[PDB]
A paper describes a structure:
The sites of MaPgb*(III) mutations (Trp(60)B9Ala, Tyr(61)B10Ala, Phe(93)E11Leu, Leu(142)G4Ala, and Ile(149)G11Phe) are located in the surroundings of the haem, or along the two tunnels; the mutations were designed to evaluate the (structural) impact of the selected residues on the stabilization of the haem-Fe(III)-bound ligand and on the reshaping of the haem distal cavity/tunnel system. The other two mutations considered, Leu(142)G4Ala, localized at the proximal site just on top of His(120)F8, and Ile(149)G11Phe, adjacent to Trp(60)B9 in tunnel 1, do not produce any significant deviation in the overall conformation of the distal site and in the cyanide binding mode relative to the MaPgb*(III)-cyanide structure. off for cyanide dissociation from cyanide-bound MaPgb*(III) and Leu(142)G4Ala and from the Ile(149)G11Phe ferric mutants, all characterized by ligand stabilization through two H-bonds (to Trp(60)B9 and Tyr(61)B10), are lower than those reported for ligand dissociation from the Tyr(61)B10Ala and Trp(60)B9Ala MaPgb*(III)-cyanide species, characterized by ligand stabilization through one H-bond. Overall, the single mutations do not affect significantly the tertiary structure of the mutated proteins, which are always closely similar in their backbone to that of MaPgb*(III)-cyanide, displaying rms deviation values which range between 0.17 Å and 0.49 Å, calculated for 190 Cα atom pairs.
Protoglobin (Pgb) is a recently discovered haem-protein with distinct structural and functional features that make it unique within the globin superfamily. The MaPgb* structure can be considered as an expanded version of the 3/3 helical sandwich typical of “classical” globins (i.e. Mb), with an additional N-terminal extension, built by a 20-residue loop, followed by the Z-helix, which precedes the globin-fold conserved A-helix. Residues belonging to the Z-helix contribute to formation of the Pgb homodimer, which is centered on the intermolecular four-helix bundle built by the G- and H-helices of the two subunits. Thus, in Pgb the access of diatomic ligands, such as O2, CO, and NO, to the haem is granted by two orthogonal apolar tunnels that reach the haem distal region from entry sites at the B/G and B/E helix interfaces.
Residue numbers in the entry:
A (entry chain A), B (entry chain B): 5 to 195
Write the structure that this text describes.
């Protein structure tokens, strides 16, 4: 088992529903074509995850105000926390590529939002760290997620045109998720 | 000369400052290289704005749940509201590329967020319309903004390298802005 990974068995049903998801997919221009290309992206990325993780957490570690969110009270990174979260992030790369975006998927999107937010941050791994990840950075991180995945999507010999379809699908899917994760951050009724 | 366009003359100072901005630029991987290329993007886009606007508002207009946010209470689109906003969106394309990202800029970023939010929506143009734009869609729209801009960035004969750099700069800058606009939506203390 991956500790903390509770896909399909969360405590709560998401407050947003499949019709909400349909309308949000429309807003990010995500279609069945992107379902196909995000699956292809998974096939490309899967055996590269260790490098992807080093690249991603190397970016987070590169700026003290970002690494901050994994820190103990003494301002140093909590290595237990980083390591446990890293295994769930690795799984999220696969889930984004391989799951159907169905009710179980939506329920886990609510869960991941809750875990970045003060509602559930630091509970999954039972760590002492900062209480909330400022929403400004959740939105910001759509960009570095896509810039991180880009070079890996080209490393299996796909043409620029195919890489572009995978990259755009990943961009749409990442934006879609962060949009959903806003729920616990946003004043009730404003989401 | 643009009705409702009050850049430099907002009633409020922004609740985020230049240090917040520096740290958020770092979160979207924005550097002096992007300053060069966002300015080049403006030079490329400036004389294409009518077609860009037709494309963008064509996208909004093609989805009833998005066009919704410009409708009168009787459910029908308010074309005056659309037209007035269109003029300020046109200017935003130039501002994104030409303004220093400084205090005045931050003040107007807070203003734009307030205008999508119930705080100020429908006041600028003195219209009667939907009270609030749900934040889920503001995040989602990062994607179709970038997808709208992309083809136009190639239309002045720049090299593929330069077009990609302009596109990435636009994506960083759009993400940066939507992150800032979240302020009035986000539970107090969670931004
Ligand atoms: C596009 C935005 C982001 C994506 C795609 C992303 C992805 C993920 C994933 C997949 C997980 C594990 C979820 C699970 O428990 O199964 C996670 C957890 C976490 N992320 Fe992010 N994340 C984003 C934004 C942020 C930001 C802005 C930070 C700031 C450094 C950050 C820091 C963390 C931390 C500290 C956790 C553990 C939260 C907890 O205590 O449960 N993430 N993230
Ligand atoms: C990336 C996200 C978005 C961008 C870049 C964007 C851009 C803009 C700009 C530049 C303006 C005029 C600002 C001014 O007053 O100077 C504006 C206003 C407006 N936008 Fe957006 N927008 C975004 C999201 C949305 C969404 C999700 C909707 C839903 C259709 C929308 C609908 C409108 C409406 C109705 C107004 C007028 C608000 C008011 O009454 O003042 N926008 N937008
Ligand atoms: C989040 N990593
Ligand atoms: C907003 N358009």
């Amino acid at each position: 088992k991956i500790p903390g990974y509770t896909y399909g068995e969360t405590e709560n049903r998401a407050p947003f529903n499949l019709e909400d998801l349909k309308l949000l997919k429309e807003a990010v221009m995500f279609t069945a074509e992107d379902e196909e290309y995000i699956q292809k992206a998974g096939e490309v990325l899967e055996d590269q995850v260790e490098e992807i993780l080093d690249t991603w957490y190397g970016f987070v570690g590169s700026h003290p105000h970002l690494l901050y969110y994994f820190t103990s009270p003494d301002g140093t990174p909590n290595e237990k926390y980083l390591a446990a979260v890293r295994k769930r992030f690795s799984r999220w790369i696969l889930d984004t590529s391989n799951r159907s975006y169905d009710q179980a998927w939506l329920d886990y999107q609510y869960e991941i939002g809750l875990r970045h937010h003060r509602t559930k941050k630091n509970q999954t791994d039972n760590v002492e760290s900062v209480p909330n990840i400022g929403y400004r950075y959740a939105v910001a991180f759509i960009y570095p997620i896509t810039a991180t995945m880009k070079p890996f999507l080209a490393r299996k010999g796909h043409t620029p045109e195919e890489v572009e379809k995978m990259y755009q699908a990943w961009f749409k899917a990442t934006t879609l998720q962060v949009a959903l994760w806003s729920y616990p951050y946003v004043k009730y009724g404003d989401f």
